[PDB]
Design a protein around this nucleic acid. Structure first.
Ligand SMILES: [Mg+2]
Lengths: 145, 49, 112, 48, 116, 102
RNA sequence: ACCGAUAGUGAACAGUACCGUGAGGGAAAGGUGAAAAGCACCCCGGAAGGGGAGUGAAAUAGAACCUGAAACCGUGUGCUUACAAGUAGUCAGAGCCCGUUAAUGGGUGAUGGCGUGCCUUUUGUAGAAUGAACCGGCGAGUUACGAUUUGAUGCAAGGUU
RNA sequence: UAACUUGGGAGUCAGAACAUGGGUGAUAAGGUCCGUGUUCGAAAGGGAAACAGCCCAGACCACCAGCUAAGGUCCCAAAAU
RNA sequence: GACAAUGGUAGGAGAGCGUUCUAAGGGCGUUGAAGCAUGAUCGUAAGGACAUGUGGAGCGCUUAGAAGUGAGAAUGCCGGUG
């Protein structure tokens, strides 16, 4: 007897959250956020529809590293031109454009499908303590760890 | 017996094997001959003795 | 109602006829006659004669008013091919296909 | 030099997307006669 | 007497053609490629009737895990406790309950907690 | 209202007046069957089976002993000359739940 | 208990087209209808072709004439597609459109999982090893006479011509 | 729970990697020649990213049931942040 | 009924499906045979029906017999078409 609930687009209700990346470790914040961008923390989780919530990371210039990672955590970016390999350390990438640091770390934990691409478009990283989306009325989340 | 109800004695008749007629018979492609050599050729046996 | 006309075994290739025939599909008859007089492909006069024949059938056999008629369908089918040869270098021959076409036009007034 | 694979129906028909001809200019001969090609003269079959 | 091939070849080939309805391009038109594709699809169907049973069990466990974290348990300990309590409900039923009836699932969780 | 029964080699969640399909049973059309393995009763008063609820039957009427849609089982090995093909229709029985006796 | 138009003669209409200086080699090509009753006359068109009218049981039987498959070429539409990386399917699955040899129906497919054609030959082939453009027809353990072994049947110290 | 004897019918005589006892080579080779096991050949399924020969295991057919092996439990990706 | 077995290449053994023809029996057909086309049908497989359209004169079924008895591959042969 086949009786398993599947979610539709007329079933799903996505809500908004705010994470504070202040005094947190990159990666350890990123995996917990990645699990929320997908509906993994929900019953009614269905794998062929998008059933996750929106996230906002606010401070994101206060993120932390543990080792000597800030001087040798190069990133490496090729450009498809002969000898066109480029480079930047993790330390200088959070000094300039800290938003691309966290965004890229979280998107690397999502599947590379047509649905993973759409799920990663709910991220909204900012540097500093304020964000524009007051009209969506987001709550705080308080990472589990 | 009637001429429309003939039956042979049980065990007396039998159908002949036809070789080289598809894979499910068990005697399809190579027809029971194995692979290459003198014995797989047409008229290929060696002399008795 | 509908009136049709066919021209069978025209000695132009169908790929060349269809190219002009895609210009008049779904237009009223007067505009289609105008278009066929100003296009300068080889198949314009032949298609024009087929269209004229259909318009005359629509009026003599079915008593339709030719002032309000549209070209409902226009298409070209393949006919039988004539097979020929051309001598090439070093004693070799190559094939040549002289292709033909069947051309059909049907006009209607849009009512019943 | 020679094609490695044959060309399917769908690829052949995609290539012929732009292979078409367009409708001509076609202004109308006002005083007398039917349509003519624009900027042209039709001494017969047209007053213009 | 002579037996000419007649009408058996066409009928046999047309069955396989009809089994390839909906395939792309010449894979629904020509006998040779159609036959190859129908063979491959029979092999795929055999293999997938057995992967279905792994996929759905994997989905139920995800849903139960999500439902148990809302009562401060993980799937691991919840199943351990339910076994020590003697409860024998499927993973498939345990996740339909958690979806439709939240109070019943809460009562299951309390018994699983008391058996530890 | 809500009951979990165990039939065949599996478990089903049922309610009053619902149709279900199970592995073949030994009954005739029109008869009445009684499921006596009940693991959980929900709704207003929740009763959780030890595994079993100790009482708690569910009664149902039988409709249509039948056999399912035709499956074709086909497999083959690549360059060996080996394949086989066979069909299968799985039998089932259909019932309508008429009373949940908690 | 021979063939039935790729068969049977090479040849159902030919030692002819055609090829070769010559000796010589050597094809393809059957079927309107019971009866020609084989489309008077009108219309568009230089004609060819066509639309009506008529003959006929039937003209999508009109001489390229019984039936009329597939490859291949078009016209019209129900569902779908312009941020996407593919052996083209398969399993899961919304939405939209329909309604059958009536049964836990049919068409399409947003999105997710898994997934390197077939044959031959090899220790081992997705193989950058071989073969096939596609569709149709044709195309490979047979028969005679001996030998041996097994099953069946008749008679039996005999059996058989 | 096999073995042997008599008769009918075969195919095979290009083998490969891994572990271990040895020759040859240079205590070289995905080398080559023997002894002893296993797997491939002729074996799908799970693991080793992918990966005939390594580790776990031998597919009669249904199922949207359950327990385990090797290997695993932050996210990709099932299970201990 | 209890118990057990059921991956497989060279290869051995068994049981069957379908095609053309013959014999005997029993049938169908201008109120429409064979062939062809479509369908959501039946059987463990090879395969068998039924309904509708086209077609216009032949064809199944049962038991037995006899074979030019089954094609996807041969840089296969012939024709047609890309
Ligand atoms: Mg086309």
């Amino acid at each position: 007897m086949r009786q398993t609930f599947m979610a539709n687009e007329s079933n799903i209700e996505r809500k908004w959250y705010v994470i504070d990346a202040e005094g947190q470790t990159l990666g350890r914040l990123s995996s917990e956020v990645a699990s929320i961008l997908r509906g993994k923390n929900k019953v009614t989780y269905t794998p062929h529809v998008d059933t996750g919530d929106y996230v906002i990371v606010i401070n994101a210039s206060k993120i932390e590293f543990t080792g000597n990672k800030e001087t040798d955590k190069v990133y490496y970016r090729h450009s498809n031109h002969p000898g066109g390999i480029k480079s930047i350390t993790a330390g200088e990438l959070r000094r300039t454009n800290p938003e691309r640091l966290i965004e890229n770390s979280i998107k690397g934990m999502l599947p590379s499908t047509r649905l993973g691409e759409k799920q990663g478009k709910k991220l909204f990283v900012y540097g500093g303590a304020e964000h524009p989306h007051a009209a969506q009325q987001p709550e705080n989340y308080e990472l589990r760890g | 017996m009637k001429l429309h109800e003939l039956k042979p004695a049980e065990g007396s008749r039998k159908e002949r094997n036809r070789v080289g007629r598809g894979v499910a018979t068990g005697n399809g492609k190579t027809s029971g001959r194995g692979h290459k050599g003198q014995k797989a050729r047409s008229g290929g046996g060696v002399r008795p003795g | 109602m509908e009136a049709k006309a066919v021209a069978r075994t025209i000695r132009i290739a169908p790929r060349k006829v269809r190219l002009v025939l895609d210009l008049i599909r779904g237009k009223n008859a007067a505009e289609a006659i105008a278009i066929l007089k100003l296009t300068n492909k080889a198949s314009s006069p032949v298609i024009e004669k087929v269209l004229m024949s259909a318009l005359a059938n629509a009026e003599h056999n079915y008593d339709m008013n030719t002032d309000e008629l549209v070209v409902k369908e226009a298409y070209a089918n393949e006919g039988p091919t004539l097979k020929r040869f051309r001598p090439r270098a070093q004693g070799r021959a190559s094939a040549i296909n002289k292709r033909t076409s069947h051309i059909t036009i049907v006009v209607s007034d849009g009512k019943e | 030099a020679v094609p490695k694979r044959r060309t399917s129906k769908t690829r052949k028909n995609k290539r012929r997307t732009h292979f078409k001809i367009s409708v001509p200019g076609m202004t109308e001969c006002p005083n007398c006669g039917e349509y003519k090609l624009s900027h042209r003269v039709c001494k017969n079959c047209g007053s213009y | 007497p002579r037996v000419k091939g007649g009408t058996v070849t066409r009928a046999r080939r047309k069955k396989t053609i009809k089994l390839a309805k909906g395939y792309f391009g010449s894979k629904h038109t020509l006998y040779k490629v159609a036959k190859q594709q129908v063979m491959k699809s029979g092999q795929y169907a055999f293999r997938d009737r057995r992967q279905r049973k792994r996929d759905f069990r994997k989905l139920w466990i995800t849903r139960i895990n999500a439902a148990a974290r809302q009562h401060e348990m993980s799937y691991s300990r919840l199943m351990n406790g339910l076994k020590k309590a003697g409860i024998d409900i499927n993973r498939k039923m345990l996740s339909e309950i958690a979806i439709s009836d939240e109070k019943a699932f809460a009562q299951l969780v309390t018994k699983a907690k008391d058996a530890l | 209202m809500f009951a979990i029964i165990e039939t065949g080699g599996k478990q089903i969640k049922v309610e009053e007046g619902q149709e279900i399909f199970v592995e073949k049973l030994d009954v005739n059309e029109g008869d009445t069957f009684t499921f006596d393995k009940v693991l959980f009763v929900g709704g207003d008063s929740v009763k959780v089976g030890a595994p079993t609820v100790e009482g708690a039957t569910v009664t149902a009427t039988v409709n249509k002993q039948g056999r399912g849609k035709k499956i074709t089982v086909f497999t083959y090995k690549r360059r060996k000359n080996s394949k086989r093909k066979k069909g299968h229709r799985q039998p089932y029985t259909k019932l309508t739940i008429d009373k949940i006796n908690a």
